[PDB]
Design an enzyme around this catalytic site. Sequence first.
Site, PDB file in Angstrom:
ATOM      1  N   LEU A  39     -47.496  40.828 -20.423  1.00  0.00           N
ATOM      2  CA  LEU A  39     -46.254  40.148 -20.767  1.00  0.00           C
ATOM      3  C   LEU A  39     -46.449  38.765 -21.378  1.00  0.00           C
ATOM      4  CD1 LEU A  39     -43.698  41.210 -18.028  1.00  0.00           C
ATOM      5  CD2 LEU A  39     -43.694  41.731 -20.472  1.00  0.00           C
ATOM      6  N   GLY A  40     -47.622  38.189 -21.169  1.00  0.00           N
ATOM      7  CA  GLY A  40     -47.929  36.869 -21.698  1.00  0.00           C
ATOM      8  C   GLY A  40     -49.249  36.393 -21.121  1.00  0.00           C
ATOM      9  N   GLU A  41     -49.401  35.080 -20.993  1.00  0.00           N
ATOM     10  CA  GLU A  41     -50.626  34.517 -20.446  1.00  0.00           C
ATOM     11  C   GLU A  41     -50.634  32.998 -20.483  1.00  0.00           C
ATOM     12  OE1 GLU A  41     -52.875  35.641 -24.271  1.00  0.00           O
ATOM     13  OE2 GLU A  41     -54.419  34.738 -22.992  1.00  0.00           O
ATOM     14  N   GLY A 101     -54.390  32.432 -17.748  1.00  0.00           N
ATOM     15  CA  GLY A 101     -55.025  33.741 -17.660  1.00  0.00           C
ATOM     16  C   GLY A 101     -54.195  34.811 -18.367  1.00  0.00           C
ATOM     17  N   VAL A 109     -50.368  37.286 -17.700  1.00  0.00           N
ATOM     18  CA  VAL A 109     -49.232  37.710 -16.904  1.00  0.00           C
ATOM     19  C   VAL A 109     -48.967  39.164 -17.235  1.00  0.00           C
ATOM     20  CG1 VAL A 109     -46.732  37.592 -16.794  1.00  0.00           C
ATOM     21  CG2 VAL A 109     -48.079  35.533 -16.432  1.00  0.00           C
ATOM     22  N   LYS A 134     -49.375  37.802 -12.184  1.00  0.00           N
ATOM     23  CA  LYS A 134     -50.138  36.782 -12.895  1.00  0.00           C
ATOM     24  C   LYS A 134     -51.584  36.799 -12.420  1.00  0.00           C
ATOM     25  CE  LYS A 134     -50.456  31.794 -13.358  1.00  0.00           C
ATOM     26  NZ  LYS A 134     -49.742  30.497 -13.517  1.00  0.00           N
ATOM     27  N   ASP A 193     -43.803  20.170 -15.681  1.00  0.00           N
ATOM     28  CA  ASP A 193     -44.073  20.873 -16.931  1.00  0.00           C
ATOM     29  C   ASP A 193     -42.883  21.666 -17.410  1.00  0.00           C
ATOM     30  OD1 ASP A 193     -45.669  21.426 -19.157  1.00  0.00           O
ATOM     31  OD2 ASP A 193     -46.767  23.056 -18.184  1.00  0.00           O
TER      32      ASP A 193
HETATM   33  N1  LIG Z   1     -42.448  35.990 -13.850  1.00  0.00           N
HETATM   34  C1  LIG Z   1     -42.321  36.563 -15.054  1.00  0.00           C
HETATM   35  O1  LIG Z   1     -41.588  37.533 -15.244  1.00  0.00           O
HETATM   36  C2  LIG Z   1     -43.107  35.939 -16.147  1.00  0.00           C
HETATM   37  N2  LIG Z   1     -43.912  34.971 -15.839  1.00  0.00           N
HETATM   38  C3  LIG Z   1     -44.622  34.398 -16.827  1.00  0.00           C
HETATM   39  C4  LIG Z   1     -44.532  34.766 -18.142  1.00  0.00           C
HETATM   40  N3  LIG Z   1     -45.250  34.170 -19.133  1.00  0.00           N
HETATM   41  C5  LIG Z   1     -45.736  32.823 -19.139  1.00  0.00           C
HETATM   42  C6  LIG Z   1     -46.681  32.631 -20.305  1.00  0.00           C
HETATM   43  C7  LIG Z   1     -47.216  31.201 -20.259  1.00  0.00           C
HETATM   44  C8  LIG Z   1     -46.029  30.204 -20.325  1.00  0.00           C
HETATM   45  N4  LIG Z   1     -45.115  30.448 -19.200  1.00  0.00           N
HETATM   46  C9  LIG Z   1     -44.574  31.805 -19.226  1.00  0.00           C
HETATM   47  C10 LIG Z   1     -43.645  35.813 -18.451  1.00  0.00           C
HETATM   48  N5  LIG Z   1     -43.337  36.383 -19.606  1.00  0.00           N
HETATM   49  C11 LIG Z   1     -42.405  37.348 -19.321  1.00  0.00           C
HETATM   50  C12 LIG Z   1     -41.855  38.175 -20.367  1.00  0.00           C
HETATM   51  C13 LIG Z   1     -40.767  39.039 -20.101  1.00  0.00           C
HETATM   52  C14 LIG Z   1     -40.241  39.836 -21.111  1.00  0.00           C
HETATM   53  C15 LIG Z   1     -40.790  39.787 -22.390  1.00  0.00           C
HETATM   54 CL1  LIG Z   1     -40.118  40.774 -23.653  1.00  0.00          CL
HETATM   55  C16 LIG Z   1     -41.876  38.932 -22.673  1.00  0.00           C
HETATM   56  C17 LIG Z   1     -42.407  38.125 -21.656  1.00  0.00           C
HETATM   57  C18 LIG Z   1     -42.146  37.361 -18.002  1.00  0.00           C
HETATM   58  N6  LIG Z   1     -42.936  36.384 -17.423  1.00  0.00           N
END
Ligand SMILES: NC(=O)c1ncc(N[C@H]2CCCNC2)c2nc(-c3ccc(Cl)cc3)cn12
EC number: 2.7.11.1
Length: 256
Positions: A12-14, A17, A19, A34, A114
Amino acid sequence: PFVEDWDLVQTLGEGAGEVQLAVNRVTEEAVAVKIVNIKKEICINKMLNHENVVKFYGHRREIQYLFLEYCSGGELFDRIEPDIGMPEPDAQRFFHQLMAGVVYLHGIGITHRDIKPENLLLDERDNLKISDFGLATVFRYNNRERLLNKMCGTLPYVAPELLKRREFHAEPVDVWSCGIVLTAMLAGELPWDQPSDSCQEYSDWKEKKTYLNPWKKIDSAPLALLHKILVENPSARITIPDIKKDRWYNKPLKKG
Ligand SMILES: NC(=O)c1ncc(N[C@H]2CCCNC2)c2nc(-c3ccc(Cl)cc3)cn12
């Protein structure tokens, strides 16, 4: 892939590291995973219990795995159209939610440090949730406030005192960053690379040249709030209780 009873679908991201999205293939419960301050991040996360803060479910070592409330809406960052922002009513609603989350954190003596659109996620209902507590710290314990002395955060979002002061209060810094987020939401751009005397954009703001971007794209109402938040002297800067009394903050807005 999988951790215990959870299988990892997509990245979903990073941070920084990675996510990942995990699914309890049995109960079908969906949560964010994460993959890896770390010690403090978990300790701090364990205190968090608010509708506008990403929930912490637990961790497992194994590389520590942090299990967090899944926000399918993604980052607020991606709801910001470059050079445009978003509809004022959406911005106001997100800001209301951001304030609620920050009030909560500050109430438990926690400072995020942040706040930025990349660290503000949205659930399926588009409810804002404060995320990424890797830089967060305790600023109040046993009812005694502790001044901050370390420089942490992201340049475009940090308050000026953080760059010029030996020690500073934690709250006004988080408030400042919220104003930068509001600016981004309404203008689709950041006002400066950093709030230093060597920054032309910051000097222009202090000189009240609001005929320049991004201020000119912002309505007078929200702009008047920004004038109270983005105040150089942290002791003169508006507090959250006062933000909640602001005219634009309380303005009924309809889209469309
Ligand atoms: N706890 C979550 O859900 C969650 N935690 C952290 C994420 N990424 C970090 C990356 C580094 C900066 N801070 C955010 C994240 N991206 C999505 C996501 C959900 C849907 C889509 Cl389409 C894309 C990303 C959901 N999350």
